[PDB]
Amino acid sequence: MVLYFIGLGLYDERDITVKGLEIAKKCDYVFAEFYTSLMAGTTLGRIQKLIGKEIRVLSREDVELNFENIVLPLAKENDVAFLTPGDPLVATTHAELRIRAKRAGVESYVIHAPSIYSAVGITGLHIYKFGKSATVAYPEGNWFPTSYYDVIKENAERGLHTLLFLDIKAEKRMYMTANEAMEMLLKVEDMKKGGVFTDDTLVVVLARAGSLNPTIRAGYVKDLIREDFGDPPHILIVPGKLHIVEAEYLVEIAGAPREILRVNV
């Protein structure tokens, strides 16, 4: 009679919470999706081994089109878990799944876990100063998306930080690097010419948040665009004007150049 939306956290199998693991262990059926994001520091086998339950992986279509014909039916006479990377209900379309549950006369509960939305706090940037968030999407055909560029503009204009998710191709396991994102932004800048993202723009790159050894780097685009940030996934952040405390952190912890203490504060 119960559906549990359980988050898996950031990087590996140990990023699930104690509450999440215990609840998952008591469930008769355990489902999961890995198309919204991937746990790059682990594998399906390691997650299954930690939970002690076989995990049935669902595709994007399984969820968005058939959640009610695949997951909810079993939840009527059993305790069912639906696992997702990060924090449940963060992916835009997931909240709607709770409505589907209600409509089916199924109780659902949410077991939280760390999300990149909060983990980016490790960059030293104040959370309250983050503005609207966006995704740098992979272009294609006659479609050249530039929305994320206006998001940066509108945020930075108000002294706000911009969190940029990088596009991902789940199955093809193709991750967009911070370098690729920077390249695209430089190209959109060439068109819009709004003076929003240039070789002199300060940016922060966070890679493998959740691991014990994340890569946190900060610097001007002209110096970081070709820097190697390690294995994915990467997250790009274009900070608004910095509070001196944020800057000192970026310098001492993320290796930022002293220059930002005078230029970006």
Ligand X SMILES: Nc1ncnc2c1ncn2[C@@H]1O[C@H](CSCC[C@H](N)C(=O)O)[C@@H](O)[C@H]1O
87 annotated ligand binder: yes
Helical packing angle, 44-51 and 18-26, nearest 10°: 80
Sheet architecture: strand order including 29-33? 56-58, 29-33, 79-84, 2-7, 107-111
Residue nearest to ligand X (CB): 86
166 annotated ligand binder: yes
Among 5, 35, 130, 197, binds Na ion (CB under 5 A): 130
The beta strand positions in 151-199, using DSSP E, are 162-166, 168-169, 174-175
**Is 133 in contact with 123 (CB distance < 8 Å)?**
no
Taking CB under 6 A as the rule, does residue 112 contact ligand X? no
Question: Which stretch, 62-70, 82-90, 182-190, 191-199, contacts ligand X (CB under 6 A)?
Answer: 82-90
Measuring CA to CA, which residue among 100, 105, 56, 48 is closest to residue 76? 105
Q: Which is nearer to ligand X, 70 or 137 (CB)?
A: 137
**Is 72 in contact with 104 (CB distance < 8 Å)?**
yes
Structure-token pair, residue 179: 């370098």
Least Å distance between CB 199 and its own copies?
27
Residue numbers of the site for Na ion (CB under 5 A)? 130
Question: Residues comprising the binding site for S-adenosyl-L-methionine?
Answer: 10, 87, 90, 115-116, 166, 209, 234
Residue numbers of the site for its own copies (CB under 8 A)? 7, 9-10, 12-19, 21-22, 50, 86-96, 98-99, 102-103, 109-115, 117-119, 121-122, 124, 126-135, 154, 158, 160, 165, 209-210, 212-213, 245-246, 248-249, 252-253
